[PDB]
């Protein structure tokens, strides 16, 4: 590349993200006073495990659909083969959502945005997967301590997705090429904005891997308990990525 082509890539990725970010950051920040009441939290904890798993599946799918559309708009993604696009989305889609989720997380009171209001981790107790919940909350807490800008999130999420190490890639070298370009774009933007201090503080790739693994493990535990629920009421896309 050259210095001009990289900056062009920076803006194009940032643009691709803005157009697919699901909810504007301002919208999430404006809603931070909107916290579930004690009565509403109890209401969430009173709901059945399966209804609650169904609801999380549906919201997860919504979020992922924006990541699909982000990838489609991401430069060079559509130039890869149909096999590789699918491989990259099966492994990285959930990881990208995980990173995006820190936008909806409030580090002051340790709450997340969920169904119109903010609630802490006790809200999710009916799911019967407290270790996963804590992990997700810890992850978002650790990301929020980085004070990510939207542009930074755009560029870091591009990289999470465009990962040339994923098993099953047919045109590996072609994916290595794109990865390196986005790496340059990210790192160039960090240099230019004096924010290279964050390179050291980004979580290891094995941390995101661990979270997604935990998700699939907890889902298989749940599916064994309620097979027909997953069969009949879970989103097809979610089933496709996760079971």
């Amino acid at each position: 590349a050259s210095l001009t082509e990289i900056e062009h890539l920076v803006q194009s990725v940032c643009k691709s993200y803005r157009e697919t970010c699901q909810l504007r950051l301002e919208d999430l920040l404006r809603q931070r006073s909107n916290i579930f009441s004690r009565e509403e939290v109890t209401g969430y904890q009173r709901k059945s495990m399966w209804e609650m798993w169904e609801r999380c599946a549906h919201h997860l799918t919504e979020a992922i659909q924006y990541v699909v559309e982000f990838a489609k708009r991401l430069s060079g993604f559509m130039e890869l083969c149909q096999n590789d696009q699918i491989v990259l989305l099966k492994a990285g889609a959930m990881e990208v959502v995980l990173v995006r989720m820190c936008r909806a997380y409030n580090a002051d009171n340790r709450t997340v945005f969920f169904e119109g209001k903010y609630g802490g981790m006790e809200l999710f107790r009916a799911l019967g997967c407290s270790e996963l919940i804590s992990s997700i909350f810890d992850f978002s807490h650790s990301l929020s301590a980085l004070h990510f800008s939207e542009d930074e999130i755009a560029l870091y999420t591009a990289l999470v997705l465009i990962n040339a190490h994923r098993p099953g890639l047919q045109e590996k070298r072609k994916v290595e090429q794109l990865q390196y370009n986005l790496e340059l774009a990210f790192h160039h933007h960090l240099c230019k904005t004096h924010r290279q201090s964050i390179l050291a503080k980004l979580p290891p790739k094995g941390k995101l891997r661990s979270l997604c693994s935990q998700h699939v493990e907890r889902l298989q535990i749940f599916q064994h308990l309620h097979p027909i629920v997953v069969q009949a009421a879970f989103p097809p896309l979610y089933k496709e990525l996760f079971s």
Binding site: Q65, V68, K72, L237, E240
Partner: peptide, 8 residues
């Protein structure tokens, strides 16, 4: 299945 449809 669904991924293919979303990408086309």
């Amino acid at each position: 299945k669904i991924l293919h449809r979303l990408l086309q």
